[PDB]
Amino acid sequence: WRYGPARLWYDMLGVPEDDLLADENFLMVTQLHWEDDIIWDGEPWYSIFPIDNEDLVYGRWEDNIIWDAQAMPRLLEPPVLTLDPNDENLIL
């Protein structure tokens, strides 16, 4: 959407239509300083748990990383605002 959020960028552009890869290495026991957590001398009809972002949990957002600007493997498209209503703190 040309007139939506990011209209400023669209106007500036002037477009007007409209073995180290082994799975264990990445397990967070081998990548997290969990020692810091140890506490020493410290001093359901509706969901009980919260619902996670399905796009973060499931989608391949990694496909929106632009590795090479000139050699971009696919063609990206303008993104429309989707106003997810799962999030609270949004009136609608």
Next chain:
Amino acid sequence: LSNTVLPSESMKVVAESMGIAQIQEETCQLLTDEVSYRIKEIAQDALKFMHMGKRQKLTTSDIDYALKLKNVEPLYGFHAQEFIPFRFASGGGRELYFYEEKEVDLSDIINTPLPRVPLDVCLKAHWLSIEGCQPAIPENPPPHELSVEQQLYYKEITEACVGSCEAKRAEALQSIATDPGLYQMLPRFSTFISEGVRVNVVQNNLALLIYLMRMVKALMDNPTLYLEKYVHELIPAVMTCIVSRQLCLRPDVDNHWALRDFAARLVAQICKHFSTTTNNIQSRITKTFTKSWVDEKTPWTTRYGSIAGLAELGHDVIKTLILPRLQQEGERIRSVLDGPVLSNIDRIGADHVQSLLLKHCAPVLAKLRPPPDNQDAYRAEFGSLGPLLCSQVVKARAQAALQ
């Protein structure tokens, strides 16, 4: 395309105005290819008075000048102001069209209002072009939806972070970081940031990317708004600021290097605050960084970004990701201590990669080695990482003395 003539059934109608009862179809074909031949010879000779007398209209005095030319008697009564009327007659099987002429009392033509007297031909001079374009004299041609409050707040805050001045930018970032009610404007900010980082591919502006990364860093420091539902948009924007290869307009002088370690610190914060075992944010970020680093053909800028993010994640990550590929430093020093092309741009990026690598691997060498470290540098790759490790042990001793 073809020779078009008057219809043959139009000559049976004409022959019955004469009184001829039955006219055979070969006679009607003989009539209509002659009268449509004489129409085309007065159609094209009327056009010779329309063209030589420059008119482009073909008035009825052009046909009367052509009937005078073909010796045929004139057609009387076609100079009066008329038009083309026709009146349909349905009838009991006989379909036709006629004129339906009207009458007028004779004293209403003797007593008509007379038109105004005509004017005589005179001349008028005016300039059409004066050594160039035409003058402008009159003888020439003329030549869910944001409320207005928060819409205005969104406009002012986004246009304050585009780069007109620095003080309005600092107050806008201190607004974003410290306001309580900025929800309902978080999706607009996420869309603005992600599309603006995408617009770097059309214009490789380092400055606007630094401004968008300071916008993300200000969005993270807000205690009231929760970025859990919108982090899937801000993660690849910061990732694009890390592992893309052209971050600069002039590659040699622009310090894309800082937008690298700033965005690497940003993504370490974004996967410290938000990584949950349902999310798998940190494991999926380490996997992208790792397969971008271990894979050859990657440019020194994107390898710098990969090493920077991996080394900002923490100590155990550089233990189990960076330290196996320390032999890659030899492949780096292949192109540093001995390069056939010295004046290329690979050398500054290579020794930037080298400096970052030995700066981050000096405390890792200080953690998992002996306290002496006599010839660890010789045992290390290129003997430089080991000197950096000795410097790091000295720095740790100085920190202990300060404590």
Next chain:
Amino acid sequence: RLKPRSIHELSVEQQLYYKEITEACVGSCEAKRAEALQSIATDPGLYQ
């Protein structure tokens, strides 16, 4: 455009099971604990 209202990845039988097992595993009654502990020890669908 509004994205569809998502559902939790647990069923309400599974969510009720989680609530019963956790409220039994805080040990108000010992037989309740011991079954809940055996239920944790051999439920095949206790992943996810």
